[PDB]
């Protein structure tokens, strides 16, 4: 019964995002019948997320459109989470409430 | 002190290194070469060694397009270079070549 915490939150959110996509789509997409690209679809997920962090338009030449609309959906969600977190942290630092060594550098990188 | 002329050995080793490691890791590739830094390796890739770069004579259309654009946006080479599909240094040299041979 470990309890979510600041150390574990980013890891937690991405953990349950990988699970969210995995359960949803592999219970949603299927008929591969053997194993359908779970490792691979998730690698497409991390690839897309990096691409959006680098602001590089990400277009895979072949791909099923439900898979693509999938990735674009969840990626936009994680983008909304990350961005909102960034705004909020800059508000906290602006008011000078939080003194942390990491959140300042991270928050900087984000902006 | 590190700066200097590019060598066929350094350039081929740069080909192989870029092939193996990938485009986004420059510090790793600069580690193998001597007398060259990471910035220099990257800009040396994207400026010249990159196979997507077009090395050949300019057709008539490319000269029309280059001249027109250069009269449209004076002195901006990094904006024009992607539009004609050539390297900024290359289209520069070719432009001074067009004014040089034009008179």
């Amino acid at each position: 019964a470990k309890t979510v915490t600041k150390q574990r939150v980013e890891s937690h959110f991405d953990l349950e995002l990988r699970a969210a996509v995995m359960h949803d789509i592999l219970d949603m997409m299927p008929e591969g019948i053997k194993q359908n690209k779970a490792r691979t679809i998730l690698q497409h997920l991390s690839e897309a997320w990096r691409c959006w962090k680098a602001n590089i338009p990400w277009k895979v030449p072949g791909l099923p459109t439900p898979i693509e609309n999938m990735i674009l959906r969840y990626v936009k969600a994680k983008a909304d989470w990350w961005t909102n977190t960034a705004h909020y942290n800059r508000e906290r630092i602006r008011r000078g409430a939080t003194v942390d060594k990491t959140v300042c550098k991270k928050n900087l990188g984000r902006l | 002190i590190k700066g200097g002329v590019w060598r066929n050995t350094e350039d081929e080793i740069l080909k192989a290194a870029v092939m193996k490691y990938g485009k986004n890791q420059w510090s790793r590739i600069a580690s193998l070469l001597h007398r060259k830094s990471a910035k220099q390796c990257k800009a040396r890739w994207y400026e010249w060694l990159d196979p997507s770069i077009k090395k050949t004579e300019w057709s008539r259309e490319e000269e029309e397009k280059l001249l027109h654009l250069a009269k449209l946006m004076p002195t901006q080479w990094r904006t024009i270079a992607p539009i004609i599909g050539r390297t900024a240094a290359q289209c520069l040299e070719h432009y001074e070549f067009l004014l040089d041979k034009a008179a």
């Binding site: 691979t40 690698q43 497409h44 990096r50 791909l63 099923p64 | 009269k71 946006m73």
Partner: peptide
């Protein structure tokens, strides 16, 4: 065949307006 998935081999792990002409020639 449709559900062939391109391997996600990882890489980690342009047009112009004609108004520029009117402006530049104007100046």
């Amino acid at each position: 065949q449709e559900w062939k998935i391109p391997p996600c081999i990882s890489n980690w792990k342009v047009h112009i307006n004609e108004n520029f002409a009117k402006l530049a020639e104007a100046l």
